[PDB]
Design an enzyme around this catalytic site. Sequence first.
Site, mmCIF file in Angstrom:
data_model
loop_
_atom_site.group_PDB
_atom_site.id
_atom_site.type_symbol
_atom_site.label_atom_id
_atom_site.label_comp_id
_atom_site.label_asym_id
_atom_site.label_seq_id
_atom_site.Cartn_x
_atom_site.Cartn_y
_atom_site.Cartn_z
ATOM 1 N N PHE A 169 -55.315 8.353 5.855
ATOM 2 C CA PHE A 169 -55.120 7.308 6.852
ATOM 3 C C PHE A 169 -53.639 6.923 6.991
ATOM 4 C CE2 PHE A 169 -55.215 2.492 6.296
ATOM 5 C CZ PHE A 169 -55.094 2.169 7.631
ATOM 6 N N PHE B 74 -41.308 7.719 -8.092
ATOM 7 C CA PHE B 74 -41.945 8.663 -7.191
ATOM 8 C C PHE B 74 -41.333 8.567 -5.786
ATOM 9 C CE2 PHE B 74 -45.328 10.117 -4.235
ATOM 10 C CZ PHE B 74 -45.601 11.382 -4.785
ATOM 11 N N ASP C 149 -42.924 7.489 12.251
ATOM 12 C CA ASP C 149 -41.700 8.162 11.825
ATOM 13 C C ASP C 149 -41.271 9.289 12.726
ATOM 14 O OD1 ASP C 149 -41.583 6.331 9.755
ATOM 15 O OD2 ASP C 149 -42.263 7.708 8.195
ATOM 16 N N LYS D 100 -51.593 18.152 -2.729
ATOM 17 C CA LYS D 100 -51.726 18.485 -4.139
ATOM 18 C C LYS D 100 -52.793 17.649 -4.860
ATOM 19 N N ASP E 69 -40.393 -1.546 5.375
ATOM 20 C CA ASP E 69 -39.840 -0.238 5.728
ATOM 21 C C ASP E 69 -39.379 -0.234 7.198
ATOM 22 O OD1 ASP E 69 -40.473 2.529 7.126
ATOM 23 O OD2 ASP E 69 -40.077 3.136 5.063
ATOM 24 N N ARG F 219 -46.433 18.237 8.350
ATOM 25 C CA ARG F 219 -46.971 17.624 7.153
ATOM 26 C C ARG F 219 -47.922 18.636 6.501
ATOM 27 N NH1 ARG F 219 -46.432 13.077 4.215
ATOM 28 N NH2 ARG F 219 -46.104 11.741 6.062
ATOM 29 N N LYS G 206 -44.930 -0.294 -0.534
ATOM 30 C CA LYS G 206 -45.378 0.791 0.321
ATOM 31 C C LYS G 206 -45.944 1.985 -0.400
ATOM 32 C CE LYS G 206 -41.328 3.669 1.517
ATOM 33 N NZ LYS G 206 -40.682 4.536 2.554
ATOM 34 N N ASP H 268 -39.223 11.141 -3.471
ATOM 35 C CA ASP H 268 -39.633 11.400 -2.113
ATOM 36 C C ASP H 268 -38.449 11.302 -1.169
ATOM 37 O OD1 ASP H 268 -41.824 11.821 -0.106
ATOM 38 O OD2 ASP H 268 -40.995 9.943 0.679
ATOM 39 N N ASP H 269 -37.616 10.277 -1.360
ATOM 40 C CA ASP H 269 -36.448 10.158 -0.520
ATOM 41 C C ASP H 269 -35.445 11.318 -0.775
ATOM 42 O OD1 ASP H 269 -37.636 7.787 0.365
ATOM 43 O OD2 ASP H 269 -36.231 6.515 -0.758
ATOM 44 N N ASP I 153 -48.331 6.982 9.620
ATOM 45 C CA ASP I 153 -46.899 7.042 9.287
ATOM 46 C C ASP I 153 -46.168 8.175 10.085
ATOM 47 O OD1 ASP I 153 -44.555 6.320 7.297
ATOM 48 O OD2 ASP I 153 -44.849 8.510 6.975
HETATM 49 O O1 LIG Z 1 -44.687 11.270 3.235
HETATM 50 P P1 LIG Z 1 -43.461 10.514 3.796
HETATM 51 O O2 LIG Z 1 -42.178 10.969 3.237
HETATM 52 O O3 LIG Z 1 -43.573 10.577 5.295
HETATM 53 C C1 LIG Z 1 -43.701 8.791 3.248
HETATM 54 N N1 LIG Z 1 -45.007 8.336 3.760
HETATM 55 C C2 LIG Z 1 -45.529 7.162 3.321
HETATM 56 C C3 LIG Z 1 -46.265 6.419 4.247
HETATM 57 C C4 LIG Z 1 -46.852 5.156 3.955
HETATM 58 C C5 LIG Z 1 -47.558 4.407 4.942
HETATM 59 C C6 LIG Z 1 -47.149 4.432 6.253
HETATM 60 C C7 LIG Z 1 -47.800 3.692 7.237
HETATM 61 C C8 LIG Z 1 -48.885 2.876 6.963
HETATM 62 O O4 LIG Z 1 -49.424 2.120 7.971
HETATM 63 C C9 LIG Z 1 -50.742 1.567 7.882
HETATM 64 C C10 LIG Z 1 -51.398 1.184 9.073
HETATM 65 C C11 LIG Z 1 -51.211 2.575 8.777
HETATM 66 C C12 LIG Z 1 -49.263 2.794 5.662
HETATM 67 C C13 LIG Z 1 -48.606 3.549 4.696
HETATM 68 C C14 LIG Z 1 -46.633 4.675 2.666
HETATM 69 C C15 LIG Z 1 -45.872 5.426 1.728
HETATM 70 N N2 LIG Z 1 -45.290 6.691 2.041
HETATM 71 P P2 LIG Z 1 -42.324 7.736 3.877
HETATM 72 O O5 LIG Z 1 -42.481 6.277 3.271
HETATM 73 O O6 LIG Z 1 -41.092 8.390 3.392
HETATM 74 O O7 LIG Z 1 -42.516 7.627 5.404
HETATM 75 MG MG LIG Z 2 -42.971 9.240 6.830
HETATM 76 MG MG LIG Z 3 -40.515 10.197 2.709
HETATM 77 MG MG LIG Z 4 -42.518 6.118 6.792
#
Ligand SMILES: O=P(O)(O)C(Nc1cc(-c2ccc(OC3CC3)cc2)ccn1)P(=O)(O)O
Ligand SMILES: [Mg+2]
Ligand SMILES: [Mg+2]
Ligand SMILES: [Mg+2]
Lengths: 343, 343
Positions: free
Chosen positions: A91, A232, A100, A50, A167, A105, A193, A236-237, A96
């Site tokens: 990135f 936010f 995860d 978005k 996290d 996505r 994060k 998301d959660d 992530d």
């Molecule tokens: O889009 P999501 O729901 O998967 C979210 N994704 C996300 C990823 C990051 C993130 C993940 C890994 C990262 O690692 C850096 C070396 C890559 C950096 C930021 C930060 C905030 N939200 P999450 O927190 O719920 O997993």
């Molecule tokens: Mg994730």
């Molecule tokens: Mg999430």
């Molecule tokens: Mg994550």
Amino acid sequence: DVYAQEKQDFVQHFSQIVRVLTEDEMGHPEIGDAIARLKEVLEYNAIGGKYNRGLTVVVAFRELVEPRKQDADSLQRAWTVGWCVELLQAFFLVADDIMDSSLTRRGQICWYQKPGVGLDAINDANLLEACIYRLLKLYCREQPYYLNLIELFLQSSYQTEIGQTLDLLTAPQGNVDLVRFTEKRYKSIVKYKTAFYSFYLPIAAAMYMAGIDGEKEHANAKKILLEMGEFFQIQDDYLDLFGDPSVTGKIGTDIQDNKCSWLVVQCLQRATPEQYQILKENYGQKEAEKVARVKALYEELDLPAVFLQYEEDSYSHIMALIEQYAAPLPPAVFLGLARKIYK
Amino acid sequence: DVYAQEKQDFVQHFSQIVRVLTEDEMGHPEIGDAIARLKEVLEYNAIGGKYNRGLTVVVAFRELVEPRKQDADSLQRAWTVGWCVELLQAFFLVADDIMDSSLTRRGQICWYQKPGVGLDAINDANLLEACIYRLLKLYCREQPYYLNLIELFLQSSYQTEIGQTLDLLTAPQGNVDLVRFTEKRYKSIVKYKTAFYSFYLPIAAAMYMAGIDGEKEHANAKKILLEMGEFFQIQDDYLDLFGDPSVTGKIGTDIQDNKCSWLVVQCLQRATPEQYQILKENYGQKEAEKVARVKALYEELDLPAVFLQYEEDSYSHIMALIEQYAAPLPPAVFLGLARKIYK
Ligand SMILES: O=P(O)(O)C(Nc1cc(-c2ccc(OC3CC3)cc2)ccn1)P(=O)(O)O
Ligand SMILES: [Mg+2]
Ligand SMILES: [Mg+2]
Ligand SMILES: [Mg+2]
Ligand SMILES: O=P(O)(O)C(Nc1cc(-c2ccc(OC3CC3)cc2)ccn1)P(=O)(O)O
Ligand SMILES: [Mg+2]
Ligand SMILES: [Mg+2]
Ligand SMILES: [Mg+2]
């Protein structure tokens, strides 16, 4: 809605971004194949969301810079810096999704799950990050704010990684992690994060672009923006489990992945000992029936209504913060941002 | 040997690096656990190698800066920038070990293979990278070379990732990749993935620290240093298969991982059609007997003697380049570096 107003020009600017990141090394043909891979990476992973974070740079720039100083070149620099925020996010997501074990996505299979990509995606993700600093150089190197922007983006990454570290540490795979899932730890995770890069970063970038570099003005903006970011992430959660994947573009894994989600934290606050035991037996495991049991528990505890109440109270709280801390910036800067995330 | 001479002080400076990267956020206790993870990451992954790249910054600094300008503070900045190069390398290795499915590194199990680490190592690796820019700020932000160093490190990363992209694209898993493995592609890979960061980066950093920032002086240094880097990578490939893991600290995977190694490129140049077929049937596969067959083929083709001849000729060629391109820098700068890698 000022975000829709600026969307098309921002999105169309993507070709130029891809073109300049591909063309800047037509002088070195031996890297042709690497450059084509980059292009494919950009096209799969930086498009389809978005664009709220990148667009925020642009809307904020328009609202903070006097219109007589919004020449064609300056707007181009603003759409470029917006795209740099989207590239940072690209990135983050790519990496992530691997960490995860995510499936989809933005409405399609995660980049690392594509046949022939797998863990090569690690490098792909880092290339998206390197693109930020090449664009800052190609477009902003002669500007007084150049260093401020480089430092902003680097520090934002560091904070974000610190938040990812928490996290991951809070959610070790195959352990019972319930004692770790407190409200205090939750607020720390999501500050680092999500909030810094998703809300402070874009507005701060626009601020420095407008020559607003004072520490106090940034601290005040931060008070508003870090709290928006905490909301936010809570949303998301919530959506990880309760949102429509048709609309979120992605399948939730928080329960399976044993996450300190806002939902599990609110669950623990409410559960009886018997409910605690149910969550202990079923949380953080890959079996569909166990995930389903957790979701039923959440529903038995009216966590959807709790979130809807939280959202109303958070919105009021953020708006109070805007009354307090917006000046001397236009309140519209913060309010457009709020309108985008509440609803 | 000037590298041994400066080693102990450089290594001991690591505590200070760890201390300042841990202490810089005693003001934010909510990130305590992330910071302890960082510390563990630093300690497992930035220690235990030979430190040649970081030490190169320091030796070069001593040789380029007039001794009267080598105050205590300036030396500290030099040992810090040396460590920044080692931190870059630590980021690279941790990620590369995952992408290469490696077993051991520096005499111990790869960080991602540790129980409880796995793909969390992705984030760990990126944190090592972020540390570079925090150290540059904490120690060098008031120096005239600050921006030059930031840009140097960013560009070095980008180049290196471009080279990793070619490394991965040239070696798709489960394909026959032999037609892709040419000498021209080989030289491009190793220039980008290894030579820029391993040889140009440390010396360039020392140059800018000494106020040598001219384009021509950097281009001349680069002519020498990029060719040393190409030899360094060839030697790395030789040792992947033929080196003593007791001494290399790591088990080789190039054959299993289907790599455009210097060995497979020299193999293809020499093999009869029957030998080509053997390599096609056995290369890039995980079965021990197939790897062993490739190694026998290499030995049947006297590739160890070919490498030893190449090493002698490369050394002579590099020394000629030093005669040509060293001035006005002390030749000792390049010669100490050469003495370290040839033998
Ligand atoms: O889009 P999501 O729901 O998967 C979210 N994704 C996300 C990823 C990051 C993130 C993940 C890994 C990262 O690692 C850096 C070396 C890559 C950096 C930021 C930060 C905030 N939200 P999450 O927190 O719920 O997993
Ligand atoms: Mg994730
Ligand atoms: Mg999430
Ligand atoms: Mg994550
Ligand atoms: O030490 P080795 O033998 O494993 C070498 N390691 C190595 C790794 C890199 C490297 C790997 C991945 C990288 O990915 C960036 C996002 C991490 C960057 C650099 C560059 C040069 N040499 P390789 O090339 O033979 O795999
Ligand atoms: Mg490797
Ligand atoms: Mg490799
Ligand atoms: Mg190797």
